[PDB]
Write an enzyme that holds these catalytic residues in place. Sequence first.
Site, short mmCIF file in Angstrom:
data_model
loop_
_atom_site.label_atom_id
_atom_site.label_comp_id
_atom_site.label_asym_id
_atom_site.label_seq_id
_atom_site.Cartn_x
_atom_site.Cartn_y
_atom_site.Cartn_z
N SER B 157 10.02 -10.91 60.86
CA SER B 157 9.81 -10.03 62.01
C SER B 157 9.85 -10.75 63.35
CB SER B 157 8.47 -9.30 61.88
OG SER B 157 8.41 -8.19 62.76
N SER B 210 4.64 -8.58 59.78
CA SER B 210 4.17 -7.22 59.57
C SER B 210 4.30 -6.84 58.10
CB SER B 210 4.95 -6.23 60.43
OG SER B 210 6.31 -6.21 60.05
N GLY B 432 12.52 -8.41 54.61
CA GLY B 432 13.50 -8.82 53.62
C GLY B 432 12.86 -9.68 52.55
N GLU B 434 11.16 -12.44 50.59
CA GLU B 434 10.18 -13.42 51.02
C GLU B 434 10.02 -14.43 49.90
OE1 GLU B 434 5.53 -13.10 51.98
OE2 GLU B 434 6.81 -12.59 53.69
#
Lengths: 371, 751, 139
Positions: B157, B210, B432, B434
């Site tokens: 983010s 987030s 996306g 991780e």
Amino acid sequence: TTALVCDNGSGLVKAGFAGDDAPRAVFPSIVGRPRHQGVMVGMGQKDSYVGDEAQSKRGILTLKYPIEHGIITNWDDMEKIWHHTFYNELRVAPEEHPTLLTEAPLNPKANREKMTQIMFETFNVPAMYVAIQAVLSLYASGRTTGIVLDSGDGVTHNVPIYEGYALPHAIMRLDLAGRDLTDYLMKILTERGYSFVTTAEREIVRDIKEKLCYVALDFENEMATAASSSSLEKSYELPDGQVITIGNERFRCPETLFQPSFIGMESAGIHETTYNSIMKCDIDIRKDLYANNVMSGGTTMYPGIADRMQKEITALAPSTMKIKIIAPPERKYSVWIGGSILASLSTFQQMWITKQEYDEAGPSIVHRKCF
Amino acid sequence: ELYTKYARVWIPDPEEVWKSAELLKDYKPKVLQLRLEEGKDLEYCLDPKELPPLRNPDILVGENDLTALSYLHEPAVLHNLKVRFIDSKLIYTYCGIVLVAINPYEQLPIYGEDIINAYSGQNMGDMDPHIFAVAEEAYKQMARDERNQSIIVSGESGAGKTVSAKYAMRYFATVSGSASEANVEEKVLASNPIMESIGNAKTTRNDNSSRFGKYIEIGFDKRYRIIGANMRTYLLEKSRVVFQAEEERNYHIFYQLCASAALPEFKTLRLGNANYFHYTKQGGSPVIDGIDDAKEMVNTRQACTLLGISDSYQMGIFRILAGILHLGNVEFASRDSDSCAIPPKHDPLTIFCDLMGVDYEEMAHWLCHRKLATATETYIKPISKLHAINARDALAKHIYANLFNWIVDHVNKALHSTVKQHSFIGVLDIYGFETFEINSFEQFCINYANEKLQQQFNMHVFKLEQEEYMKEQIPWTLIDFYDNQPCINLIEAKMGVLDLLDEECKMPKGSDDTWAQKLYNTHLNKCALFEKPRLSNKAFIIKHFADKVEYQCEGFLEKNKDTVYEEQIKVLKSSKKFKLLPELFQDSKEHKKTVGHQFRNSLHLLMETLNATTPHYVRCIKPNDFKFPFTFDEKRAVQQLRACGVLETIRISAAGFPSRWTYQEFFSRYRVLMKQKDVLSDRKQTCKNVLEKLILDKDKYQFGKTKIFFRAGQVAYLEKIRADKLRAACIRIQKTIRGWLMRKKYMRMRR
Amino acid sequence: FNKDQLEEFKEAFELFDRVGDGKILYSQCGDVMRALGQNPTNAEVLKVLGNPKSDELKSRRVDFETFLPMLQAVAKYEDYLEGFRVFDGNGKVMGAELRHVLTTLGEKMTEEEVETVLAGHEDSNGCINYEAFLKHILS
Ligand SMILES: C/C1=C\[C@H](C)C[C@H](C)OC(=O)C[C@H](c2ccc(O)cc2)NC(=O)[C@@H](Cc2c(Br)[nH]c3ccccc23)N(C)C(=O)[C@H](C)NC(=O)[C@@H](C)C1
Ligand SMILES: Nc1ncnc2c1ncn2[C@@H]1O[C@H](COP(=O)(O)OP(=O)(O)O)[C@@H](O)[C@H]1O
Ligand SMILES: [Mg+2]
């Protein structure tokens, strides 16, 4: 689709849905046929009464129990009791939902065959399984290791289990029961001058047994003290409002489990079957069984029975070794709560007997998968 | 052969991931003779048999669309992006329908209003990629056909998904002509400090990550004016409220509260130091560098005010949060394994109860016992200390998740607007893939949510290309399709990883690492994509879409258990002291659901929403760890291009017919290679005959109505032969003119 | 080569001798080959010279007798037309484009060589009749 979990015992029937925390239907298991000539016209005479209705009507009816010990005594009657359970008490048709059914550790294979036959053939059950009660009590009580002691009406049995392995050669069966305790309670009540002969009055006796009996922590001391005074003594109210008052007898009714010579049975009391079951097992696991010992089914509801077993096992077993007894308040239901857990598990979904596997092989198949 | 002297190749270099090289002598079947930029001396070995990736000719490099490159591989993509970013200062780029974005940390003029107008009518082909080109295509799609349209954004983010969405709304507003009518962007951007305060956390790799998916529906009128907006949220990561691994924090709001604790405004709450509380302590990392939490708290309040949540409700919110913190410091003693008790006059339960107005006796009782009801008869039953801890942490999660749903309902109440929502365009912000050196149930959830989004993307792309081929009257049957259903079935099918976790939660003496044995028994060789790491029996490896990731059982059961005892809710629900706490619960089986099951159910809502709708994608990329504006680092960008699926999308595009040319566009460039007899009066038949003679393998190209397609690399092969034949002709004429000059010098001597 | 050819070639060689020692430089060998009617590529010239190094190319001197085997070795239209058709379709070629390709591709030449050879051959549009220019430069 979510699967029914249903336990036939002599006595109560518990049924309900898997994943519930407590059973949806509980009712005594009775069939009643009327024994008087119906005089009124337009009465609505009914061929038979099933479960709780018959217990309300019972004065009029004669009550037969279709299950004795563990063994199903006649099959039309249970076909009724299941029909009533599914259709009115659960209001869910047995085609729609898989089912899990429950049995004593040792029973004639003929009954488990007939049970699967009625389930597939008469009710068109999609799939089902039969599971030994002590296993379910273990699932119910958070343990993979213990000796289970279970008693309802009918069977009393022990099964030891260690990290999820049964030890079949150590399984004990014994026929001391809520029922035979009631019958002895009647025969001793005769000595105090009160008598209950007919089938319905036996259930009054059973309500006495449920309310008022308790186990002597030490037997001769309390027997002497009850001869010495009426401080023990208490009284209870028959359905017509007559009063009856019961004595030193009060503890003597549950005591017979601990000394079956009181009923003239031969086997030693439950102490010695519990201990002999442990000793029959391999000698390392015994340390773990003594620490984890678990009680199930209604006949172990008597107040005091836990502390009496701690005392007398701790005498009987080798000293300097921890002995602990686990008696959760749930224990009357724990065979159902364990059935709920087991039926909810994902792994189990392989293990149903699916209808095709019956169609191929007939009722013989139940022995292969189930136990 | 493609390799010759004065061909060019990428080589692996640890200084930066890929480095340019030029080939000095033709290769013939074990060592290669090579120049770097620097040194210009090397040997490189094919090390069985490898070949080094071959470099696209400069005509292709820099052109707007990554698919237009004839070789498609990680080095070429990374180079083309780098040159567009550094030399042209072009941030936006395309890969097929996907739009890739790399954020600068400098601010740029290119969003300026004029450019909106310049995009406003065009198709995306007519223009360089820019975020408005997607907003425009969504707008036109919603106009042309009645369907709704969705815009889907992804990537860590820090990459500025927020700025991309903000400008997407600014475009919608300005082309719609609703700038007078609407405050939508103004309110939406006013909302962001609230969501950033209650949804964001410090993960071990990044600050202000987030943890939730956020979806915002811009409503249009029947006349395509903006009506207003509606907000939804998905995939909230409840487990972080209770548990953290080292150098994490839980959601920012707790720290923003503790920082402000010294103000009289919160004197009631008896807040302490930020690591006094068992929920905030465990991360070891109270402070984020360079954020003054108090200064963020102020902005959080002012955003709440600007959204019309009163001074009455805000103090309710913080009252609840302080309640969750104080609840965390409750502690139990075991009296026997079957039971526990709370110490007498226990201080933090005292304070918590006064924060809630629910009496100390009542919840001191219900915290440590649970109630059965059979049909006939109730039973009241002690619980082990471990289960008491589980049940408290459950309740804390349930309270937080409901407070979140509540705040999002009020923010919607402010955004929502009366007029009938005729159709809508919706803009979605999601993380996306991780992956860290340690991966845990939160990563497992994030990666499964990505596996689903990646499936729905793959099917949408395959639909578009299966459409284009039939538009071009080619056989579609040729086009192959790649399906990650075999992974999703491993994660979510019955007796998947989730269902064996949710089973292991309830099985008796179920425990963290005997779950793993159920995994290995079920999958270890029976499945394709599941692997055990050799070193360990506590871990397992899933071949996800982009990459392998290992996970570790160490957290899974304690993170996954959620069960809420009905009457511990009943106690709170009864409370009279203040309004909000009864308002939260105001809406039976949900209380048994594990966190992984509530996550699977939340994900199915999201997929059912998007499957209703035609997507348009974006991707975001963070081109250096350090915020140096307009600086690009290949080892980071390669990691993010793998983590955004961009590379694996391009790899799927490589399989067949990435490269497209129209007959006149091809014919002009290649006319150099055509002999006079081969030129025909008909362009199509000319180029057919030329291509059939120049390329013998007919499986490499396909003819259609206007566009020829080529499997990856044939265009580069043609540019190679074009350069070779033209260079030979140029050398011949050059040598001739050099001889003419000589001949004049010779005549000069003779004369 | 016969005696007459060898005499004419030796005379030409001596015209390229700028030092009086009866020799030319290696770097002049190509000049002599082209002056004698050959059109060798730089690669061919270096090959017949034995790929000399810069130092001997710029300062080592060889007489006609050493040059001669090299001249022999070097000695031992439709392609030219296709070569011109590369840069074609009205039969003309931009002067700017021909200049760019001749100074930037292949064995790149200087701008002055191209200006010298192109003088007088381009029209008002800046177009060269390449068949005529080719015939002219091949004579
Ligand atoms: C005369 C004898 C046997 C019988 C009267 C002879 C008849 C012929 O046997 C049957 O086939 C009938 C029936 C039976 C019922 C259902 C069924 O699908 C098959 C058989 N089984 C019974 O009545 C069992 C039931 C039982 C008790 Br309680 N616990 C048990 C533990 C395990 C198994 C079974 C049981 N039962 C009461 C007895 O054996 C009694 C104790 N046996 C005896 O006194 C000895 C001297 C032999
Ligand atoms: N509180 C109680 N005290 C004593 N006996 C009880 C009590 N509750 C039930 N029982 C007796 O236990 C028997 C029923 O046990 P249960 O375990 O319910 O049988 P099943 O396992 O077949 O359902 C009956 O004899 C019943 O009277
Ligand atoms: Mg039973």
